[PDB]
Amino acid sequence: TRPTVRPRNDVAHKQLSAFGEYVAEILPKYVQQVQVSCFNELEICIHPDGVIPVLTFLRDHSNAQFKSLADLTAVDIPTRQNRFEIVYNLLSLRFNSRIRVKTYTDELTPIESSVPVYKAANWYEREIWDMFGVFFANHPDLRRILTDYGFEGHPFRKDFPLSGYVELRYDDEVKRVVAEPVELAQEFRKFDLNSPWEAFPAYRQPP
Amino acid sequence: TYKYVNLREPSMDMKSVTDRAAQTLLWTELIRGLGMTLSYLFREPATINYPFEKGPLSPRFRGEHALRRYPSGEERCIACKLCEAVCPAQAITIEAEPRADGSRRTTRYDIDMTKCIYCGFCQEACPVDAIVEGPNFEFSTETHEELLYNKEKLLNNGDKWEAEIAANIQADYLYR
Amino acid sequence: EMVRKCDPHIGLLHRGTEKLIEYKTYLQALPYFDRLDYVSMMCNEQAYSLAVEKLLNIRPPPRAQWIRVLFGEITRLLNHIMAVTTHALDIGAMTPFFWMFEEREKMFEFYERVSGARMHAAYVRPGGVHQDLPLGLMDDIYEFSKNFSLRIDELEEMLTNNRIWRNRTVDIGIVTAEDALNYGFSGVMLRGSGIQWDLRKTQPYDVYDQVEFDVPIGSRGDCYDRYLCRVEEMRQSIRIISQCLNKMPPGEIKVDDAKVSPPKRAEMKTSMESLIHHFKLYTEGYQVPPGATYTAIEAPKGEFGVYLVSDGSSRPYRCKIKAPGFAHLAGLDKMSKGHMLADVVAIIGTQDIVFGEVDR
Amino acid sequence: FGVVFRASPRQSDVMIVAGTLTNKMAPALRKVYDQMPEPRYVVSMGSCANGGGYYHYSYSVVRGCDRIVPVDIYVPGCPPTAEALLYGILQLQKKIKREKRLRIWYRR
Amino acid sequence: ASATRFIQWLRNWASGRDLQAKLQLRYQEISKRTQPPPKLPVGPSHKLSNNYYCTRDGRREAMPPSIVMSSQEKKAVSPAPPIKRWELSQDEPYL
Amino acid sequence: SNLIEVFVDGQSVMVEPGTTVLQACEKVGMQIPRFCYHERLSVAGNCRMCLVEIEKAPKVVAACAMPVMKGWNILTNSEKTKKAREGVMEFLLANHPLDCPICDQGGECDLQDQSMMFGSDRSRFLEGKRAVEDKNIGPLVKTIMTRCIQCTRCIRFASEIAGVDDLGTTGRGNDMQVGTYIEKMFMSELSGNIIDICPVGALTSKPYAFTARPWETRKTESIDVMDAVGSNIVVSTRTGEVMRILPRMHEDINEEWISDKTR
Amino acid sequence: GVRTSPTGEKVTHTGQVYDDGDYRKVRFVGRQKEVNENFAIDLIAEQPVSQVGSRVISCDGGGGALGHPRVYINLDKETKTGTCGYCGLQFRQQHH
Amino acid sequence: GLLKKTTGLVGLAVCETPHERLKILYTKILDVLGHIPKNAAYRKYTEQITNEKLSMVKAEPDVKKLEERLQGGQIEEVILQAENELSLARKMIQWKPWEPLVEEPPASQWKWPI
Amino acid sequence: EDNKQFFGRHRWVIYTTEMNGKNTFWDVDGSMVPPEWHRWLHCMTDDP
Amino acid sequence: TRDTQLITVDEKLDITTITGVPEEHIKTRKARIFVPARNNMQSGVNNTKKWKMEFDTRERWENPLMGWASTADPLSNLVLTFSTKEDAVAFAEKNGWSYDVEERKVPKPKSKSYGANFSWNKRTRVSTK
Amino acid sequence: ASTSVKPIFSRDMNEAKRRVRELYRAWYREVPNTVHLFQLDISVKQGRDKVREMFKKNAHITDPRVVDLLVIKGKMELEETIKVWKQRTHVMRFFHETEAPRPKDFLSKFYVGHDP
Ligand SMILES: CCCCCCCCCCCCCCCCCC(=O)OC[C@H](COP(=O)(O)OCCN)OC(=O)CCCCCCCCCCCCCCCCC
Ligand SMILES: CCCCCCCCCCCCCCCCCC(=O)OC[C@H](COP(=O)(O)OCCN)OC(=O)CCCCCCCCCCCCCCCCC
Ligand code: SF4
Ligand code: SF4
Ligand code: SF4
Ligand code: SF4
Ligand code: SF4
Ligand code: FES
Ligand SMILES: [K+]
Ligand SMILES: [Zn+2]
């Protein structure tokens, strides 16, 4: 085949598609959309009420057995009404397969903690709360994990500035480290890099 | 394929039980560890006599930056700003204008050596081999301000190190 | 003497890497991955490169893939020397650190001879590797690998049968197989408990399905079995490096598609098309078709992955880094239960924690 | 060279700042510095400690450890080679050799 | 390499190995620091004909995800067949 | 009821008679590549970058000039279209100079960008290149005519928009040259606009020369105060300094032009 | 080359020099103003014009791939030399 | 049919009576599935796989050969999975995932790129 | 040079006692090696 | 539908108090919601598809040491992308930012005729090609 | 409808207000320990006035879910203080002791710069 072109795997594509329909048939109450990517990754998009039921089924069902929570993160998309996309990446050692489960939320809508299903989720959900400000209901110990104590804001939101709002220095008069509004000797230089010509016709959107 | 790292059941005969008792009481496996450190005591150490001796490097080594010239002495940099665009740390600041003779040349070329990650992307991006990372790694300073290089500093580095820089480029440009 | 609760407070090395990456082109973000698990630099680069290559729908040429496996396993040796000897150094056994860091110093030379840097090479890139191996490098890697198993034996002579070492590691930090899975462990944290899993075997990438090696599996799930697994994995890396040296193919070392990989400097200075593509790749960068992938590798510390989201432009929209040490440290409270303060030092060591990846 | 490897902060004469100083970490670094007995010196090692480096524009990173403590030697690199750091330590030795504490005292 | 035979014997006996055959210090077995210049090969796309970019454009063959189900009798399936059981190493099953 | 039905890659679009193939593709959001075509200039049809396959027609048509016919299916992404674009881009770049690092157009060049999106990634041209004398047409527009791709946009602008007939082509074939023949300054109150319409670095702003790259500028959309027309403009700034003034389209005011004083 | 201002400060090849009342020159007291003394504008002017026997000549800066991108220079005008945009070398057509 | 000393998975004890344990668990699962509506896909599919697994148990007396048929790893791993499925089925009865979609997402919720 | 020494100790420099007016009998510095020798002393090449 | 018991909230959505933004950069800022103008130097239209939100420009000054461009404005680089004008307005309102909206400027359809270049009796006849 | 939303903790403002008063009492009683434990140079009166100032600035909220998140964040802040996860620098960051008073009248802003 073409030496520079990634080869397609049509068997895995068909297997993942069939299992995606399988999941959607069993949990119609929650599954909103199922898709398989051209590089063979299965995504299950669900209503946020289905977090615990869907994850529990995927972990415990005999034909699923997704015992490992590889990763749990969020994505901020300000143009959406529910700006926060919550992404669960699961691994099945029994069937040597991965699956992605996605749901959504806004700044004020809690999501149910998945710690009951995966104890791995404990710190991942603290990170989502810290970095995105998404609240997780019934989390055993929800608090910041990566930011400074007393830090204000959620810095992975698309509208949080790259350099933040405050900066630190040691002040000799008060004999301690103090926080002050950020000033930069050199402002970060924004580059406009996007070409004005379309690159990928296959992804064109209706006018 | 897999192997077990620790799944051996010890034998339980006199010969073996007494061998393990001897090890427990006579500390034999502890004595063995002493033998290894004693053997090292009589090996030649690996220490080099810095600064009279130096660790080996290669022509690809990424060290202190320098701006280069053509054999005529004209600057190579024609202020394209590919280096400034690619710099992952935004460590490069460039301004340019037409020179008196109309040539396209920089009026500012600053590298904040305390922002720089010494990645060498700038010298990959440069279309005329103007900016390079030379072989010098012994340029620590006593003040922060001394590490904010302007164009004069960088041209001086080029004139200072060109003899070595040119030979290193000659040795590696066929891999580029 | 007993530990009742262990609450790790991290973030002391959180540097907002994931937010910084959103302001970089894909090439510009590559060096951030050297600085995560900063003991396994080129393995971090490989993971990011595989993820980008997947979204790009391209594949790197065979010689680059063999180079990436070769230096991936050299990097595993770098990491395991650090993991084992700093684990030993922190509980008093200082001497193996010195013996093995001379070996690390020589593998830093291989890094420097291919990339010009001892650690943050930035050498593995989407599309292949930056430059081809300099002439004479493979011979020197052969000479290093020939004597390395003796160095491992000397390390084992100091620790493996030592009753003091065994007293500090045996039955310390036992993890059951079911807990290891649900807590999100990977790598040796799984194989120490008998779970037969290794992404190089089960979900292979590059040319790992063309090399022969064995996965070491523990039986007790304690610190000592995890120590044995790491030492045996170093032997397997030498075995893999031996095959990479023999089976290294000829050819180009980066994909021959100048809309992704920059052209050769000689071409850039003669051909109009090459110059344009060089100009655009180093300013705008290549555009990546829209999409999202979770790509994972068997990094020396465990499963290392990126959830990379492309919006169709030349800068990633989101890059979430899955560091294996993040879940491992989250399990420290679970593992330290019923142990003494001195054991917490041993448990942190057996997890092989680097806060670059934990805090990002 | 007489530079002991692992020395406790109570007996240390020089602090080497080797890595990124985050905001969350800055108070703890200043505390160690304040507890060092004199004479005390600070070596800033690598781009991050020198001025923020790759993370200069981050919301969580101190842009150079010299906002927190006074720095005697700046060692550039990302990372500086082991030899580069040694060069910097030997530079500090020569800086100490140039000190004139008693000459200045005598002329007060 | 310069150790007397007595010291060589002493450290070999103390370590229990023949250390001289695998010295951890490098001598003249290492490759020259000056090498002849390379001549690197070119990739498969270096051709003067039958080389149109549209026949080898990987990025333009990427497609958006297949939607197998959207909100807007049969045999049960697993995401893939169950993983085959690993075999014991025949190179060294037990350490 | 005068609209006719045509298809763009099989999607139906209703267009009025006289609509070109290029305009039909615009309606479905597909931008055909072009060099010579400009929607505010007379059609030229000489660059051939807009060539596209019509389903069942053996010959590609120039999308910018061909009127679309009822029932036509325009294949904007077929192998036949893509091979036509690659062929044309190859001819454009054969004699083009390796000037991108020193050329002000770099970073906002339609030749660069359309080469990336629609051209090949390498060269098979093994000859020497044409080189052309530079023409002096005044202190506002610098000319580097070795970069000219003979799209004749400047000629059509000067004749039709500015009402000046000083620009033409002299010679024939590969030595055909855009210019004024005699030594003449193209001094018109609208002269600076030929910098914008010129797709390449052949015509560039002399005052702006060498001072900035496009990616590093910040764009502030603003209004001209040099007269009472109220031309819409973009003020390019970099690191707190004004770098240049560009037109900003406003169909009901300045279209996409500005006067030289504004510029 | 390196000239001096009335205050005694050297003028860089970019024309920079602090004027009389600029406090910022205090940074040079007890230290020095780094100035590079090889002005490239003067050095390139010392080079002689190459006489060639064709209308078009090409320059790559010398040294092959170690130079700059190869460009072709037109030499039809007889009232000026052809200058290389990259390295500043000059060419002139002999006879014609 | 010897008794293996260990499962190899830390924390997973050897089972002395695997066939009898499996029959009890699969039978319990089928009993639980009778409380789900007949047309729920969870019931149809889960009954299909459970009966296939239960049939293998009733037909293969050798543990070593049974494990090959089930393809679920050790027999203790198979037992552990049966317990997980039994636990899941009881939770499914409360969740009733077979009911219609609770709510449609906003119009462009799953649109990428934006 | 002494090629019988192991790699890293096979080349060395004894610094001058006075350089650019500075008394360097005791105060030596790796930065004193000029670029032409720097390449040889760091084994970037074989030939002096 | 749901088993989760919802509540009724008629309040206008406002999240200013829980975003951590300083008071200065909520009330004194002006957000501009617009579709970017096409860069006149190029004919490509692909950068005119989405809506953008940017903030009012503030002072930049020269760094005394190097002459670099310094700033005290934390929002100087923040640019948000939106699918529709309504999405951009919704985001600005709930964040408490004052805003202006500029209507999209679509080029008007043109009547193009190659044959007009050769008119028998009209001024569109071209004198050159 | 679109106004039918999922609550966090409080189903209406009266339930939310109870949580606010409980948080305020916890902070009010913590200040004396904080001043002693962190050896601050502020008085207990200054600390309690700072607590009151922080609660007042959010007095205009009428959305129970917003109030819920304010209380959730306020409780996290309290836990950091009580457990001594904060250092004295973090506690003193509420008082902006090193920041000079920025002018507030039109004329004073006019003299210093361009900002409104
Ligand atoms: C005819 C009949 C006459 C009657 C008399 C006959 C008596 C002879 C038979 C008895 C032999 C007695 C041996 C005396 C040594 C004591 C043995 C001992 O206690 O060692 C065991 C001890 C514990 O061992 P462990 O495996 O950890 O646990 C076992 C308990 N569950 O583990 C240890 O103590 C190990 C040591 C710990 C310290 C390690 C660090 C030091 C090791 C290096 C020492 C080198 C040798 C020192 C020699 C110095 C001599 C001056
Ligand atoms: C600063 C350095 C100074 C030295 C200068 C140079 C001179 C070096 C002299 C030091 C001699 C010791 C160094 C050599 C030790 C290494 C030898 C070795 O490794 O032997 C290992 C051997 C086998 O052990 P193992 O593999 O476990 O087998 C178990 C079942 N067979 O294990 C054994 O067989 C051990 C047998 C001995 C057990 C004795 C138990 C201790 C009894 C204490 C008596 C101490 C008497 C000596 C004290 C000094 C007085 C002279
Ligand atoms: S080495 Fe890397 S970080 Fe440093 S100036 Fe060059 S491109 Fe920028
Ligand atoms: S150093 Fe090179 S890449 Fe940078 S502006 Fe100069 S010519 Fe361009
Ligand atoms: S190696 Fe570079 S990125 Fe890492 S801590 Fe040092 S300066 Fe920072
Ligand atoms: S006109 Fe475009 S392609 Fe030609 S040299 Fe200038 S930037 Fe490069
Ligand atoms: S100068 Fe520019 S606008 Fe005029 S014909 Fe040449 S490329 Fe076209
Ligand atoms: S755009 Fe149609 S031929 Fe030029
Ligand atoms: K132009
Ligand atoms: Zn030239």
Short mmCIF file of C-alpha atoms in Angstrom, two decimals, chain J residues 3-122:
data_model
loop_
_atom_site.label_atom_id
_atom_site.label_comp_id
_atom_site.label_asym_id
_atom_site.label_seq_id
_atom_site.Cartn_x
_atom_site.Cartn_y
_atom_site.Cartn_z
CA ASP J 3 -35.99 10.63 37.38
CA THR J 4 -33.96 13.62 38.64
CA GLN J 5 -36.23 16.17 40.32
CA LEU J 6 -35.62 19.53 38.67
CA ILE J 7 -36.22 23.01 40.07
CA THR J 8 -37.50 26.18 38.43
CA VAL J 9 -35.14 29.16 38.21
CA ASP J 10 -36.29 32.26 36.33
CA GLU J 11 -33.15 34.26 37.10
CA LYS J 12 -31.09 35.60 34.23
CA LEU J 13 -27.98 33.45 33.99
CA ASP J 14 -25.07 35.37 35.53
CA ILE J 15 -21.80 33.73 36.56
CA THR J 16 -19.63 36.78 37.28
CA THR J 17 -19.29 36.00 40.98
CA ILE J 18 -18.02 32.45 40.38
CA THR J 19 -15.53 32.99 37.53
CA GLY J 20 -12.72 34.47 39.62
CA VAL J 21 -12.28 37.45 37.29
CA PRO J 22 -11.25 40.68 39.06
CA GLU J 23 -13.89 43.39 39.18
CA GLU J 24 -11.81 45.61 36.89
CA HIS J 25 -11.97 43.17 33.97
CA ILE J 26 -15.73 42.65 34.06
CA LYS J 27 -17.28 46.11 34.29
CA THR J 28 -14.69 48.31 32.54
CA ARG J 29 -14.18 46.01 29.53
CA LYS J 30 -15.99 46.22 26.20
CA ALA J 31 -16.29 43.03 24.18
CA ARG J 32 -16.50 43.24 20.40
CA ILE J 33 -18.49 40.48 18.67
CA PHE J 34 -17.80 40.35 14.95
CA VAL J 35 -17.01 38.17 11.97
CA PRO J 36 -13.39 38.95 11.01
CA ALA J 37 -12.91 40.85 7.78
CA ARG J 38 -11.14 39.02 4.98
CA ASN J 39 -7.44 39.83 4.86
CA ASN J 40 -7.39 41.92 1.70
CA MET J 41 -3.92 40.63 0.78
CA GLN J 42 -5.44 37.22 -0.10
CA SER J 43 -8.55 35.90 -1.82
CA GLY J 44 -9.20 32.96 0.51
CA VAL J 45 -12.41 33.31 2.51
CA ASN J 46 -11.92 30.50 5.02
CA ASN J 47 -11.11 32.87 7.91
CA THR J 48 -14.49 34.63 7.57
CA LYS J 49 -16.68 31.69 8.62
CA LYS J 50 -16.85 32.03 12.41
CA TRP J 51 -17.80 34.71 14.90
CA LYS J 52 -15.12 36.13 17.19
CA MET J 53 -15.15 37.94 20.51
CA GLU J 54 -12.26 40.25 21.38
CA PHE J 55 -11.72 42.94 24.00
CA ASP J 56 -10.84 46.62 23.89
CA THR J 57 -7.14 47.31 23.36
CA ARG J 58 -5.22 48.78 26.29
CA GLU J 59 -1.83 50.37 26.84
CA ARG J 60 1.37 48.72 25.72
CA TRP J 61 4.65 50.39 26.67
CA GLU J 62 8.33 49.82 26.03
CA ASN J 63 10.32 47.81 28.54
CA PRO J 64 13.12 50.06 29.88
CA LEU J 65 15.76 47.32 29.63
CA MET J 66 15.16 45.82 26.18
CA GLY J 67 12.47 47.91 24.50
CA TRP J 68 10.02 45.00 24.50
CA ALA J 69 6.29 45.68 24.44
CA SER J 70 5.00 45.39 28.01
CA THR J 71 1.37 45.17 29.06
CA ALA J 72 -0.73 45.17 32.21
CA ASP J 73 -3.87 43.90 30.44
CA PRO J 74 -4.56 40.22 31.23
CA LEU J 75 -7.17 40.01 28.44
CA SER J 76 -4.91 41.44 25.72
CA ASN J 77 -4.68 38.11 23.84
CA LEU J 78 -8.04 36.50 24.63
CA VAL J 79 -10.01 35.73 21.45
CA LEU J 80 -13.04 33.44 21.57
CA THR J 81 -14.65 31.64 18.62
CA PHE J 82 -18.38 31.10 18.19
CA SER J 83 -20.61 29.37 15.66
CA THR J 84 -23.32 32.04 15.66
CA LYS J 85 -23.81 35.62 16.76
CA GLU J 86 -26.38 34.41 19.30
CA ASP J 87 -23.86 32.06 20.94
CA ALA J 88 -21.36 34.91 21.25
CA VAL J 89 -23.95 37.23 22.81
CA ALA J 90 -25.08 34.54 25.25
CA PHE J 91 -21.51 33.96 26.40
CA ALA J 92 -20.87 37.68 26.91
CA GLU J 93 -24.08 38.25 28.86
CA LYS J 94 -23.62 35.47 31.41
CA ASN J 95 -20.03 36.66 31.98
CA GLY J 96 -21.26 40.20 32.59
CA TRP J 97 -19.31 41.82 29.74
CA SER J 98 -20.66 44.85 27.94
CA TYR J 99 -20.55 44.19 24.21
CA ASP J 100 -21.13 45.51 20.71
CA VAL J 101 -22.27 43.29 17.84
CA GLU J 102 -21.26 44.01 14.26
CA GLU J 103 -23.38 42.40 11.57
CA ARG J 104 -21.73 39.98 9.19
CA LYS J 105 -20.70 41.47 5.84
CA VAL J 106 -21.38 38.97 3.07
CA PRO J 107 -20.08 40.03 -0.37
CA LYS J 108 -23.00 40.67 -2.66
CA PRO J 109 -23.44 38.40 -5.70
CA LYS J 110 -21.89 39.85 -8.84
CA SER J 111 -22.90 39.56 -12.49
CA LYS J 112 -19.86 38.24 -14.37
CA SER J 113 -19.81 37.86 -18.14
CA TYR J 114 -16.68 37.10 -20.12
CA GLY J 115 -18.51 38.01 -23.33
CA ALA J 116 -18.98 41.56 -22.03
CA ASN J 117 -15.25 42.11 -22.58
CA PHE J 118 -15.97 42.33 -26.32
CA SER J 119 -19.06 44.53 -26.45
CA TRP J 120 -20.07 45.98 -29.81
CA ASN J 121 -21.47 49.21 -28.34
CA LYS J 122 -20.84 49.27 -24.57
#
